Write an enzyme that holds these catalytic residues in place. Structure first.
Site, PDB file in Angstrom:
ATOM      1  N   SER A  61     -33.889  66.031  11.167  1.00 27.20           N
ATOM      2  CA  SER A  61     -34.350  64.883  10.555  1.00 27.20           C
ATOM      3  C   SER A  61     -33.773  63.543  11.223  1.00 27.20           C
ATOM      4  CB  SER A  61     -33.845  64.554   8.974  1.00 27.20           C
ATOM      5  OG  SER A  61     -34.236  63.365   8.519  1.00 27.20           O
ATOM      6  N   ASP A  84     -45.113  65.311   3.885  1.00 25.87           N
ATOM      7  CA  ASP A  84     -43.532  64.765   3.989  1.00 25.87           C
ATOM      8  C   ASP A  84     -43.530  63.566   3.084  1.00 25.87           C
ATOM      9  OD1 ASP A  84     -40.799  64.211   3.943  1.00 25.87           O
ATOM     10  OD2 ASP A  84     -40.956  65.064   6.323  1.00 25.87           O
ATOM     11  N   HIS A 105     -40.766  68.435   3.646  1.00 29.08           N
ATOM     12  CA  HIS A 105     -39.772  68.066   4.331  1.00 29.08           C
ATOM     13  C   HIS A 105     -39.010  68.996   5.386  1.00 29.08           C
ATOM     14  CE1 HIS A 105     -37.495  65.214   6.727  1.00 29.08           C
ATOM     15  NE2 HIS A 105     -36.348  65.187   5.789  1.00 29.08           N
TER      16      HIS A 105
END
Lengths: 134, 846, 138, 144
Positions: free
Chosen positions: B713, B791, B823
């Site tokens: 991320s 997402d 995600h």
């Protein structure tokens, strides 16, 4: 079988439960090949034995593949204080190598859970235990 | 330099790489365990039975797939020197806790995305001690059962009773009323309902959701934690039962309050993200607060109701504060946490402002809430009726120059001794720089308020002065607060049990200290491991789920034992074990922890996975795995096999895997975390680069010419920052889910580690990697962008805008989409594709 | 309670410890086709008697071939081969020695022979290093 | 952005998947023809006795059922091939191992061959990689 007294078959109450009772009339016992194992007791006695199942005791325990079944999972019904040795059918690896003799963990069940006793000694194809055999 | 001394990775086929991932899968299934959690001790109180307690917890037996409510029997006496492994008895009789093939509602799958609950089954349950009530949600329908209260315990499993309803839709977030266990409450259609188990009678309490149209046209919710609260402040419920029962006394009736957060999300930006049902080609609207845009308009409210001995909700009543919330409390953007004092006297709430450098805890007494009606004369009437003395007490006020991390430790003591002057415990990181517990005694000095007229609050208006603030802990370590850790305060022995990093930053140990004096901090756990613990409510025995970098996680049950006159030095003795340590696979080599010092002479920790079948002399391709962002510590003495097996797979192909926590990563205090303030993305890569040059010097198998930087991320964001600002060292960059433009990301995160775009224009332009695309390599196959299409956290727009600016700057890339994954790549098939793509990309182009 | 044997092993790395017990082939006397089942069991007569009870419910009879004389490692993949491999239709190409109770049916290799006659050669071989450990003429 | 570790890969494959092959192989000698029912249900132990009692009071027989060595990963359908499929009738091929409660009749594969003779081969494999999940040939020796 019956060791010192000659041929006396262990009493079975029903095939479907695999229960095996005997009354020992003698001091001392000999290895039963049909069970592949031996318990010794030095007086006349009733004993009941089960060969039940390992699956309904070990699939109920989570890291069961951090163990492997190496025996029959005896159940014993005798009076306390009088059994003086039980020999469980160990499966051998000491003929080769890379096995410790100290970290062995005997499985003593209760309705509480699995207990892991330290066994007193391991044979080639058995292990000996102390007098409180439950 | 030497092609006879540069290790060449064997070029496997694609099917070969799948064969490798499946051989990881077979071993991998055994390695993952989904360890027992959510422990609940209940005594047996028999003194003649065999079992001292019953431990209730969630777990999957492994016989089945979905995790379910289970229990163990903790005995009064263990046979010593022979470990008791607990039986895992089932409460429920092997029913489906989730529907077929994992279908949920869209709000349930979203809530499991915010909590990151990858496991299926009974994910969370609620429990009431005295009634012995287990209220849980199975297969989108509430269920309950009871085990050993006024009834007795069991040895067989029972049927879980279903709760019948007339409500159409899912019934989320159920909670038993602690004051009355016959009553419970839930969220339905973003409105608070309340029910009663045995009579089946349900009753709505809030009317903020008309259910008329889309969420673009029906914006008010109640008892629902919004997006930014769910995903950045780790709060998932927005309503809190009052734990005690008050009696207004009409003739015999009994009030039961609930504090809830009403949210009017009309003025917040709506974004459309594709739905899971790709065939329909429709999106879902999401009230997503972009950075700089305005947050939802929040407010606290009491939904009360009154009942009788027959068990019927006779009366009901919404209440709201005497002034509007925004005006009575200026500079209050987010309600971080809330609840009640255990006696019921006050409803507390942690407020927090938009800069996130100003947090303050406040107590709100229930008489401050007048009824709510549109009649302005009834409103003035009860504004007259509220007493002059009663007052919200801003009890605690944390102010900082870096940012406030939300510490959910707050233990208000009973204050009936010395009948004023609330004494509480509170974690405070901003004071000394490290999260440390304090005992704080404030003085509730009401000055007298006329609540009918509207006033403007001052800057320290309700702020009570502090009587005293004794410091119970101090040092270069922190007390763990966030991420669902907690303290346990035995008020009978007067001790506070906390978790901390006092022994070392890499390990979480259970400590105890007294809150009379900071005598000494007693560790209750073995060193060399990291522990997640959970106490009995009787404070006599705990569970610890612990692990190390080498050993898998085990779950041992300890028992505090010693002379009762000295409770602080009670020795934790291992009583029994619940889930013993799993088998590390034979191909799995546990990784090596190291540390080093920077040019600023700060100590950074790191991990390394050595290449399997390492050949001395040979230099190896190095995958710098990275997250490097706040609120996450990659490097710690804990099992990295159940979550970072991919790193070992890389090692097993022969890649050196390096993992560094540079400055910003948590559990090392605020000054450490604060090196990224208003330059996030900029300093981490220097820490990662320095970590490479140290590991290159220390171990001789790091080839600097072949370095890959992989992240997901914030790690993917950093991998792209690595390839931009350090191009000569990093050969390739596998950037998954990257945050490419900070101005597009949501408020709670960005507004805290940088700030509003009007404030930090240089920081946003230097940190948004998509605006720096010209410095990406002109060479091809050096950049692989991975992104889940559906997402909701790091929206697909980020990858899309990156690819847009790559197109405009004329730079190559590669790209992989996961069309059904939000995600985290959730489905195992899609995860297997992700891993074979990663191995292939490294194989060919690194 | 019940009492169980030591089965501690280790968690850090593999051992694949050897087992002592026997490998057993069972027979049929069915008139159309005669089906043998070659089992891979790690235990002794009580587990064998439980298997006997199941097989008795599904009409099997057995002759007792001699046991293996090299120890054979638990859970390892052991390819089974034979004189009837290929020329007769038999044996799934793989076998593990992992223990499961007789309640959950055992791993076995099918063998259609037609006439039982006397008996033909069988083979068992470790997939790791291709070692014969057992044969018996039946 | 609280680090989806994203390791995932939670197949959670059950050791019941060998005895899901045991549910497999139901045949019925009511007419001159013989036909088969195929079931693969993990995630409940009671499905064994449930589908057992259901299909013997629905007049079917249990066969040998060799077990797969691999406890099969959940979430993936498994195809059916062999000498049987393509010559004699099999109504569905692929099996998705999905849960239902044991009180319900599940999805099953129905397999008609008429007269039996020397036997005929049925195979269960994966479509993901085409590796052998299961392989046997039917018996003319385990019948009435």
């Amino acid at each position: 079988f019956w060791g010192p007294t000659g041929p006396v078959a262990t009493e079975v109450v029903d095939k479907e439960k695999n229960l095996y009772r005997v009354h020992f009339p003698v001091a001392g016992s000999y290895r039963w090949p049909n069970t592949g194992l031996c318990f010794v007791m030095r007086e006349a006695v009733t004993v009941e034995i089960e060969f039940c199942v390992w699956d309904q005791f070990l699939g109920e325990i989570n890291p069961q593949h951090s163990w492997m079944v190496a025996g029959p999972l005896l159940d014993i019904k005798a009076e306390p204080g009088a059994v003086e040795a039980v020999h469980l059918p160990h499966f051998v690896a000491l003929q080769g190598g890379h096995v410790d003799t100290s970290l062995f963990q005997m499985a003593h069940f209760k309705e509480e859970g699995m207990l892991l006793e330290k066994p007193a000694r391991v044979e080639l194809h058995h292990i000996v235990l102390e007098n409180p055999s439950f | 330099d030497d092609p006879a001394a540069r290790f060449q990775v064997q070029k496997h086929s694609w099917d070969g790489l799948r064969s490798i991932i499946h051989g990881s899968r077979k071993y991998s299934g055994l390695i993952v365990n989904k360890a027992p959690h959510d422990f609940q001790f209940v005594q047996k109180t028999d003194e003649s039975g065999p079992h001292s307690h019953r431990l209730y917890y969630l777990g999957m037996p492994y016989g089945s797939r979905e995790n379910s409510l289970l229990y163990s029997e903790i005995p009064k006496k263990v046979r010593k020197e022979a470990l008791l492994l607990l039986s895992w008895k089932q409460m429920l009789d092997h029913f489906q806790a989730t529907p077929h093939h994992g279908v949920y509602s869209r709000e349930e799958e979203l809530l499991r995305e915010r909590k990151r609950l990858g496991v299926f089954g009974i994910t969370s349950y609620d429990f009431h001690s005295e009634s012995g009530l287990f209220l849980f949600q199975a297969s989108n329908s509430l269920f309950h059962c009871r085990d050993g209260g006024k009834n007795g315990f069991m040895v067989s499993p029972m049927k879980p009773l279903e709760i019948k309803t007339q409500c159409s839709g899912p019934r989320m977030d159920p909670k038993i009323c602690p004051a009355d266990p016959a009553f419970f409450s839930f969220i339905n259609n973003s409105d608070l309902w309340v029910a009663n188990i045995e009579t089946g009678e349900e009753r709505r309490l809030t009317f903020c959701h008309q259910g008329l149209s889309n969420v673009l046209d029906d914006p008010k919710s109640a008892g629902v934690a919004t997006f930014v609260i769910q995903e950045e402040f780790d709060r998932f419920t927005g309503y809190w039962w009052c734990p005690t029962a008050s009696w207004e006394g009409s003739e015999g009736l009994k009030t039961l309050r609930i504090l809830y957060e009403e949210v009017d999300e009309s003025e917040v930006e709506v974004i459309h993200v594709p739905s899971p049902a790709l065939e329909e080609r429709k999106t879902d609207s999401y009230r997503y607060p972009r950075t700089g845009s305005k947050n939802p308009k929040i407010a606290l409210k009491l939904a009360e109701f009154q009942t009788d001995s027959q068990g019927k909700i006779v009366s009901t009543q919404e209440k709201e504060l005497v002034q509007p919330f925004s005006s009575l409390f200026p500079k209050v953007e987010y309600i971080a946490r809330a609840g009640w004092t255990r006696d019921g006297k006050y409803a507390w709430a942690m407020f927090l402002d938009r800069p996130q450098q100003w947090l303050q805890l406040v107590l709100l007494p229930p008489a401050l809430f007048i009824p709510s009606t549109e009649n302005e004369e009834q409103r003035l009437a009860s504004a007259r009726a509220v007493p002059r003395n009663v007052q919200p007490y801003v009890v605690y006020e944390e102010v900082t120059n870096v940012w406030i991390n939300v510490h959910d430790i707050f233990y208000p003591f009973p204050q009936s001794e010395g009948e004023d002057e609330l004494c509480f415990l509170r974690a405070n990181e901003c004071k000394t720089g490290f999260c440390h517990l304090y005992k704080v005694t404030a003085v509730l000095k009401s000055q007298g308020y006329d609540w009918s007229e509207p006033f403007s609050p001052g800057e320290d208006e309700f702020k009570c002065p502090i009587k005293e603030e004794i410091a119970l802990t101090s040092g270069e370590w922190e007390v763990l607060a966030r991420h669902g850790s907690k303290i346990w305060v035995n008020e009978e022995t007067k001790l506070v049990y906390f978790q901390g990093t006092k022994d070392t930053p890499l390990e979480h140990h259970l400590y105890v200290v007294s809150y009379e004096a900071a005598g000494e901090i007693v560790r209750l756990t073995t060193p060399g491991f990291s522990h997640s613990c959970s106490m009995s409510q009787n404070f006599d025995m705990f569970v610890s789920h612990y692990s190390s970098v080498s050993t898998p996680p085990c779950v041992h049950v300890y028992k505090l034992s010693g002379p009762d006159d000295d409770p602080l030095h009670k020795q934790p003795r291992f009583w029994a074990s619940m889930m013993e340590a799993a088998s590390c696979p034979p191909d799995y080599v546990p990784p090596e922890i190291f540390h080093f010092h920077t040019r600023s002479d700060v100590r950074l920790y790191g991990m390394i996975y050595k290449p399997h079948a390492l050949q001395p002399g040979k230099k190896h391709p190095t995958v710098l795995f990275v997250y490097g962002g706040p609120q996450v510590q990659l490097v710690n003495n804990s099992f990295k096999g159940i979550k970072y097996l991919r790193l070992n797979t890389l090692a097993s192909l022969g890649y050196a895997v390096v993992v560094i926590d540079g400055r910003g990563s948590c559990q090392r205090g605020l000054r450490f975390e604060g090196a990224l303030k208003n330059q996030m993305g900029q300093v981490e890569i220097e820490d990662q680069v320095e970590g490479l040059q140290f590991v290159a010097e220390k171990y001789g198998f790091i080839d600097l010419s072949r370095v890959a930087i992989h992240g997901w991320s914030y790690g993917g964001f950093l991998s792209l920052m690595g390839l931009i600002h350090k191009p000569q060292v990093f050969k390739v960059a596998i950037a998954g889910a990257p945050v490419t433009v900070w101005m597009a990301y949501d408020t709670g995160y960005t507004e805290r580690y940088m700030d509003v775009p009007e404030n930090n224009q240089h920081g946003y332009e230097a940190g948004s990697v998509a605006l720096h695309v010209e410095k990406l390599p002109n060479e091809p196959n050096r950049l692989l962008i991975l992104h889940g299409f559906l997402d909701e956290n790091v929206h697909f727009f980020h990858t899309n805008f990156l690819v847009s600016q790559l197109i405009r700057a004329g730079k190559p890339y590669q790209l992989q989409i996961y069309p059904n994954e939000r995600h985290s790549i959730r489905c195992p098939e899609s995860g297997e594709h992700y891993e074979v793509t990663l191995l292939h990309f490294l194989q060919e182009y690194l | 309670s019940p009492l169980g044997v030591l089965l501690k092993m280790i968690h850090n790395a593999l051992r694949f410890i050897p087992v002592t017990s026997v490998v057993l082939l069972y027979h049929r006397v069915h008139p159309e086709e005669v089906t043998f089942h070659l089992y891979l069991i790690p235990s002794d007569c009580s587990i064998r008697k439980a298997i006997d009870d199941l097989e008795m419910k599904f009409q099997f009879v057995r002759i007792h071939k001699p046991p293996p004389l090299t120890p054979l490692y638990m859970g390892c993949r052991y390819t089974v081969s034979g004189s009837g491999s290929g020329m007769l239709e038999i044996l799934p190409k793989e076998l593990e020695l992992c223990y499961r109770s007789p309640g959950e049916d055992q791993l076995f290799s099918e063998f259609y022979v037609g006439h039982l006659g006397s008996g033909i050669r069988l083979q068992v071989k470790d997939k790791k290093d291709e070692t014969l450990v057992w044969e018996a003429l039946v």
